[PDB]
Amino acid sequence: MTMMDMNFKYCHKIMKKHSKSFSYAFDLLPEDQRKAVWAIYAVCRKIDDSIDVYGDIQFLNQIKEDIQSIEKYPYEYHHFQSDRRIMMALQHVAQHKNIAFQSFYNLIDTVYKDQHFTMFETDAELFGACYGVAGTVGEVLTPILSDHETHQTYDVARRLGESLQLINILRDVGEDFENERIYFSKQRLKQYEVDIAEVYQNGVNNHYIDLWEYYAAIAEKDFRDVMDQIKVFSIEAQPIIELAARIYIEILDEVRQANYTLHERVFVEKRKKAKLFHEINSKY
Ligand SMILES: CC(C)=CCC/C(C)=C/CC/C(C)=C/[C@@H]1[C@@H](COP(=O)(O)OP(=O)(O)O)[C@]1(C)CC/C=C(\C)CCC=C(C)C
Ligand SMILES: [Mg+2]
Ligand SMILES: [Mg+2]
């Protein structure tokens, strides 16, 4: 094992630890592509988790500055300020692939703004936040998972990322509420006559289920639209991306089976993930 191998192994550790669904799928990529995914993953994770390190923007600004160094000077040695192992790996990737740096900056800005989080007035705001947290990730992964990037490739990847973020929201309603976050828009909550606090205390009702299913239907339709355009991605990545998405889509059915509970995080069992892989893989 080289030093750089050690750097990617560490990124892999982070992804396996923190992202059971995405780890399962993306680890099936060919070596050079999965390694790039691990590095992108670990960067994004550090960005997402940065505020809780000291309680403020310090570690985040250090990440941003590290990324800026890489963008400006991809072939120079940097004394990274944040997590050196992750940044060395990102830099190695950047030397070989087009990285959409502005997409990382969009994600960072999204994390900065989350410090001042006020509920979304409308679904348009909510979907805007989904872009910032996850459409950006889709954009960053595009050159990794496709052979000749076009506007269509980016668009599909962005849509997928945003759909997965909406599923994430749908899984985590109760936990988010405990953390003083509600992501359903004020407009939709008012229309469906849903108070999340009241539902957290008293159990689901038909109003809440109707509202949840309204968003679920959006995530599903977007998922189907991505599946229909899967050929934008490289032949090797197609079944893997399909797997990643299907595993995440299955979370919706898990929520339903747990009666839309606001008091635990549902999950797709490993054995089910394997079932989905068999189904997809026979198709390919
Ligand atoms: C780079 C990579 C694979 C992921 C990035 C992971 C990170 C940390 C981003 C920081 C912001 C966050 C938190 C975003 C949410 C990820 C789930 O959180 P995680 O905690 O890992 O898993 P779980 O909550 O299930 O335990 C999310 C739903 C976005 C998924 C978007 C994807 C996969 C692109 C799809 C498009 C193509 C594949 C073209
Ligand atoms: Mg996680
Ligand atoms: Mg969540």
Contact predicate 276/250, CB 8 Å: yes
Q: How many CB atoms lie within 10 A of CB 246?
A: 19
The atom number, within ligand 1, closest to the CA of 233 reads 39
Q: Is 21 annotated among the ligand-binding residues?
A: yes
The structural domains of the chain, with segments of one domain joined by +, span 1-284
Measure CA 219 to chain center. Answer: 14
CB count, 10 Å around CB of 29?
Answer: 20
CB atoms inside a 10 Å sphere around CB 201: 9
Q: What is the 3-state secondary structure (H, E, C) of 153-188?
A: HHHHHHHHHHHHHHHHHHHCHHHHHHCCCCCCCHHH
Buried b (16+ CB within 10 A) or exposed e, 101-140: eebbebbbebbbeeeeeeebeebeebbebbbbbbbbbbbb
Alpha helices in the chain (DSSP H): 3-18, 20-26, 31-49, 51-54, 58-72, 84-94, 101-114, 123-130, 136-145, 151-171, 173-178, 186-192, 196-202, 206-228, 237-257, 270-283
CB-CB neighbours of 74 under 10 Å: 15
The set of residues, in sequence order, having a beta carbon less than 8 Å from that of 197 and lying 6+ positions away, is 177
Our CA angle for 164, 166, 171, nearest 5°, is 95
Residue 219 CA: distances (Å) to CA of 78, 202, 235? 41, 26, 24
The angle at the Cα of 150, spanning 109 to 69, to the nearest 5 degrees, equals 40
Answer yes or no: are the C-beta atoms of 57 and 40 closer than 8 Å: no
Rounded distance, CA 1 to CA 119, Å? 48
Nearest CA to ligand 1 atom 39: 157
**Distance of CA 221 from the midpoint of ligand 2 (Å):** 24
Total residues belonging to the chain: 284
Measured CA to CA, the distance from residue 234 to residue 145 in angstroms comes to: 6
Quick one: which atom of ligand 1 is closest to the CA of 133?
11
Give 1 Cα–ligand 3 centroid separation in angstroms. 35
Q: Which residue type is seen at 166?
A: L
Distance CA 185, CA 191 (A): 10
Q: Which of 144, 168, 254 for mutating ligand 1's site (highest number of atoms within 8 Å of CB)? A: 168
Say which CATH class 1-284 falls into: mainly alpha
Do the Cβ atoms of 82 and 66 come closer than 8 Å?
yes
Token representation of residue 269: 């069992």
C-alpha 232/C-alpha 117 separation (Å) is 35
- Phi, psi (degrees; rounded to nearest 5) at 239: -65, -30
The tokens for 70 are 């890489």
Tokens of 270: 């490993």
Q: Closest-lying ligand to the alpha carbon of 176?
A: 3
Q: How far apart are CA 265 and CA 263, in angstroms?
A: 7
Instruction: Give residues after which the chain gaps, C-N over 2.5 angstroms.
Output: none
Ligand 1 atom showing the smallest separation from residue 241 Cα: 38
Tell me the C-alpha distance between 254 and 194, whole Å: 22
Q: Please, which experimental method was used? A: X-ray
Calculate how far, in angstroms, residue 15's C-alpha sits from the geometric centre of ligand 1.
10
Q: Which of 85, 4, 78, 95 is nearest to 43 (CA)?
A: 85
Long-range Cβ pairs for the range 15-18 (8 Å, 24+): 15/41, 15/42, 15/45, 18/45
| CA–CA–CA angle 275, 36, 163 (5° rounding) | 55
| Among the listed residues 230, 245, 236, the one whose alpha carbon sits nearest the alpha carbon of residue 29 | 236
Q: Is 55 left (phi over 0), alpha (psi -120 to 50) or beta?
A: left
Q: How many CB atoms lie within 10 A of CB 204?
A: 13
Cα 206 from Cα 227, distance rounded (Å):
31
Q: Is 159 annotated as a binding residue?
A: no
Determine which residue's CA is closest to atom 8 belonging to ligand 1: 45
Provide the resolution (angstroms): 1.9
Is 181 labelled a binding residue? no
